[PDB]
Ligand binder design. Structure first.
Ligand code: LX7
Ligand code: LX7
Ligand code: LX7
Ligand code: LX7
Ligand code: LX7
Ligand code: LX7
Ligand code: ZN
Ligand code: ZN
Ligand code: ZN
Ligand code: ZN
Lengths: 360, 360
């Protein structure tokens, strides 16, 4: 069976399971079950399923080199799929809540969940809670007797937490740290002293890399009972690097990809985000250019946005991006090499992960 | 050591642990750690700690009848405290998110977290995520080697989920089920056909009773390794009953307790909540009274609110409340009796839980 069709089939299985359990154990009625089915579909489906399919890919790699009964191959693949959906539903929780936080309008060329007419923020915050709660519901159902259950739950737990810490780093990235204070409305930074590569790295590492790259990789290892074919510190380092690169591309697209292609109208500039463009700009601009940036960034006025975009366009950020990209290639290739010492197979799964990121 | 002082001391311990781990493992800076400490204090402290102290109380009951080394008594008490804080932090997660959902203004005579000037909804939704994530962080730290870890996590998991399902039942309780639909903005019910005792019961059971009464009781059992001194179905039934009663009182207070005493301005009538008052009213009103109710309920206009309040005041709902209360006494006393067959001690803990609810 092709991997994607397996993975989509398991979605239907997991859906049915969750909704049947709501009827048998949680006294749900058919209309609320329908609302939840629609919510689940709308918020979990329609992306590329990169994250969830990485779990399946890493497990397939191990199957090709490990002796097992057919029923065991099927069970490992089923578990990789359930695990992959846990990550997809975790992502869905965070997109639902982040869209509400940020006042976002669209996602993937469709309205954000909370904007649907019969949803509203009042419901959608709770729908996002439910999303994450289903990850747990899946795990304990499907993995109840499995030897990797504790390590999977503890891993998932840590990644969830890291992610919520990363959101905190993201939404606060335009304020001066020394002024953070629940009692005082937060001004935007005027110095931009905190728009540094290391601060940017920290945001990205926590907000994106743990759930996008670390968790799918390590979940493939866990459902394959293969965590001893790797040096876990290498897996972390390679996840953090590739995840960085992913986010750099996302930041560039926010500013420069046409909205019809991007699936939304990018607002990083108006939102005063600590983006790769802003940090890279401030790391090379002259005094006059920095002063123009400060007078225009983080403002809704389209004239001011156009000025920041112009400043980026003239600062030859393509050169910095090339150089960055070239360095990420060296470093990711070096980690891949390292990973071969203990597992050629795992090393190749990582190379696929890198190719899919590096080309897209 | 007195139980409450133990429990508060453990809060400081758990706080320090969480914030120290954020600095050593999650690259936090001192200002964001300060924001989080303030958030944790503001959102977890200042209530009566009924829920968390029930875990400690049930464990103390078992200590008085079970032989143990002193170090074991201390360890069980410490675990009961950590468990009690898990429940307090779970509650805090749900109050933070529910206040945002509902557009609530105050809680316990102070502004809702999201209304603090330097918080905002953008941060507070994520702060509430963090709250719940800390429950997990605590459990796996403090309970990593404990024989009750899986049963505690699985229980907690189910209660969290039940709670989020209950919110869904609550926020949708004023719409007609057959019209629920993410594509269509939801009208308020005009028939009130769904304002029945059984539908009300379902809301309350899921929204409140599992986290307020079931979880603290069963968590005391689990940290005491005493789940075999009870018949779990009795524990559930008694939790659901007492929890019902708690909520009935809360609904009555929303309408009739002065706001200075209540800690907030109650808006159940304007919000068109399925409250005990509305269901009890509609179960005894005549045609004219039902028609007046329909023309005035669920509207912000204070004249209309006053009309519904007047309708409640003339419908002699005190008589229904007395009768309800008398029946809850019979039934709770009967469950308590049952619980004595296997554990007098547990039975008494339940009697305390009932007294504290029934008198407050
Ligand atoms: N299936 C879809 S796309 N439903 C939808 C329709 C309308 C809508 O309100 C808007 F966002 F456009 F204001 C949101 C969602
Ligand atoms: N500084 C770093 S790299 N801290 C970190 C590492 C691992 C971790 O657990 C995981 F999320 F990976 F499961 C959490 C935080
Ligand atoms: N000129 C450049 S390329 N400056 C830069 C380097 C690193 C960086 O953080 C990372 F992208 F690596 F996450 C951000 C900006
Ligand atoms: N400690 C407190 S009570 N701080 C606070 C002050 C002001 C405030 O804004 C308001 F809600 F009143 F609009 C909220 C909280
Ligand atoms: N109908 C009922 S009473 N359903 C139910 C019982 C138990 C349960 O697990 C728990 F939350 F208690 F852990 C969840 C739902
Ligand atoms: N007249 C009355 S007392 N009617 C009623 C009974 C039960 C009920 O649900 C519960 F309170 F039990 F949760 C609500 C209303
Ligand atoms: Zn965001
Ligand atoms: Zn972006
Ligand atoms: Zn609410
Ligand atoms: Zn209430």
């Amino acid at each position: 069976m092709a991997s994607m069709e397996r993975f989509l089939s398991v979605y239907d299985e997991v859906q049915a399971f969750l909704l049947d359990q709501l009827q048998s154990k949680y006294e749900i009625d058919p209309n609320r079950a329908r609302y939840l089915r629609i919510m689940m579909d709308t918020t979990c489906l329609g992306g590329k399923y990169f994250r969830g399919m990485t779990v399946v890919n890493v497990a397939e790699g191990f199957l090709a080199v490990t002796q097992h009964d057919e029923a065991t191959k099927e069970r490992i693949l089923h578990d990789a799929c359930v695990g992959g959906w846990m990550i997809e539903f975790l992502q869905a929780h965070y997109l639902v809540e982040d869209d509400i936080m940020d006042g976002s309008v669209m996602r993937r060329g469709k309205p954000c969940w909370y904007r649907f007419p019969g949803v509203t923020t009042q419901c959608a915050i709770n729908d996002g809670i439910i999303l994450k709660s289903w990850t747990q519901i899946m795990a304990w159902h499907y993995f109840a007797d499995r030897p990797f259950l504790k390590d999977l739950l503890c891993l998932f737990q840590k990644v969830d937490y890291a992610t919520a810490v990363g959101q905190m780093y993201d939404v606060t990235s335009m304020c001066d740290s020394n002024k953070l204070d629940p009692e005082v409305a937060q001004p935007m930074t005027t110095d931009f002293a905190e728009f540094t590569p290391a601060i940017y790295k920290r945001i990205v590492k926590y907000k994106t890399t743990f759930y996008t790259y670390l968790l799918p990789l390590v979940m493939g290892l866990l459902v394959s009972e293969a965590a001893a074919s790797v040096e876990m510190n290498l897996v972390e380092r390679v996840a953090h690097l590739i995840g960085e690169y992913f986010q750099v591309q996302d930041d560039v697209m926010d500013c420069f990809t046409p909205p019809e292609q991007l699936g939304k109208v990018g607002t990083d500039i108006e939102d005063a985000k600590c983006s790769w463009l802003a940090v890279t700009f401030l790391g090379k601009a002259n005094a006059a250019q920095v002063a123009e940036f400060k007078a225009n960034y983080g403002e809704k006025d389209p004239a001011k946005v156009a000025v920041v975009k112009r400043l980026y366009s003239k600062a030859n950020l393509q050169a910095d991006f090339a150089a960055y990209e070239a360095e990420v290639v060296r470093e990711v290739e070096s980690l891949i090499e390292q990973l071969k010492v203990k597992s050629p197979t795992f090393a190749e799964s990582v190379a696929v992960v890198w190719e899919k990121t590096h080309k897209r």
